[PDB]
Design a protein around this ligand. Structure first.
Ligand SMILES: CCN1CCN(Cc2ccc(-c3cc4c(N[C@H](C)c5ccccc5)ncnc4[nH]3)cc2)CC1
Length: 305
């Protein structure tokens, strides 16, 4: 319905200096790097994505869909595209999230992550997701591995590789085949490939469950083909040790069968907020990056146009 007037910024390879792999694998490579725009006199820590080195018409069409989705979002809890680079190999350029992905970070820091932070991340992810819902956009791959950490106090949703904008008031996206992560999908997704803001809510549920168990693997063991039946029987993920029943009842709600019975992200914000005001009431936990002339460095969140 509304026209998407986002600007896509095309960036010169000369404008940015790579500085080391951060992750290789399926997709391709992600690099730490710096971006020095025009003459501006500002340097911008960036991450730079390159979906493998291979230039198969397949690959290139996908990375441009991300660029498309990422360029159209603008919210403190959603990762924004800074620009693309049209080298032989199409590069995605984004704000550097120096602490990496949230999944790895809870893992690597169990003995130091307190309730204030767990609940705050929950709120922040709810905000990201609520905003995505506003822009009528369905992520389809929300998971702890897809939330990045700019600072321990500030997280942002990423990985729009599967995100689908909902056209002519279409209330559910009917999907193809392809590899899809089962352990984070609503039931309507596994059975009917229906995806809706409310199936995003389910994945939220599981994401929250990853954070609360400090990075456990949902249904660890149980292999993927079993999942839809396990869920049909009525089984859900167990209550994490640190969780009060208040918090777990929120997860469980996100995992209901009737999609409209699940909470809305705007409600999830409210509830986790309340909870964030008294975190020890709601979680029971025992115990409760700069490397070369950094004079003109500015974080992307302060670089506007
Ligand atoms: C001590 C723990 N250890 C070291 C820190 N990390 C390594 C790491 C650091 C940064 C990142 C990172 C990825 C990333 C990122 N990747 C996404 C998928 C992306 C999206 C579009 C364009 C480029 C990247 N985007 C923005 N900032 C980012 N930062 C990934 C892994 C994890 C494990």
């Amino acid at each position: 319905e509304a026209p998407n007037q986002a600007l896509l910024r095309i960036l010169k390879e000369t404008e940015f200096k790579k500085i080391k792999v951060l992750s290789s694998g399926a997709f391709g490579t992600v690099y730490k790097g710096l971006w020095i725009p025009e003459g501006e006199k500002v340097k911008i820590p960036v991450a730079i994505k390159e979906l493998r080195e291979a230039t198969s018409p397949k690959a290139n069409k996908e990375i441009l869909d991300e660029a498309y989705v990422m360029a159209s979002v603008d919210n403190p809890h959603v990762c924004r595209l800074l620009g693309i680079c049209l080298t032989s190999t199409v590069q995605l350029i984004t704000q550097l999230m120096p602490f990496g992905c949230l999944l790895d970070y809870v893992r690597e820091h169990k003995d130091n992550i307190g309730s204030q932070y767990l609940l705050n991340w929950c709120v922040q992810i709810a905000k990201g997701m609520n905003y995505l819902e506003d822009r009528r956009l369905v992520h389809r791959d929300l998971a702890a591995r897809n939330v990045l950490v700019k600072t321990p106090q500030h997280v942002k949703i990423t990985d729009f590789g599967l995100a689908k904008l909902l056209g002519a008031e279409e209330k559910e996206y009917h999907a193809e085949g392809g590899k899809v992560p089962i352990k984070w999908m609503a039931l309507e997704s596994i059975l009917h490939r229906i995806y809706t803001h409310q199936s995003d809510v389910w994945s939220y549920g599981v994401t929250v469950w990853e954070l609360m168990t400090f990075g456990s693997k949902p249904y660890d063991g149980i292999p993927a083909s079993e999942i839809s039946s396990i869920l049909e029987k009525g089984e859900r993920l167990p209550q994490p040790p640190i969780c009060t029943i208040d918090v777990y009842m929120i997860m469980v709600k996100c995992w209901m069968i009737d999609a409209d019975s699940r909470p809305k992200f705007r409600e999830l914000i409210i509830e986790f907020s309340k909870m964030a005001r008294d975190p020890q009431r709601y979680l029971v936990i025992q115990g409760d990056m700069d490397e070369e002339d950094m004079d003109d460095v500015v974080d992307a969140d302060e670089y506007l146009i």
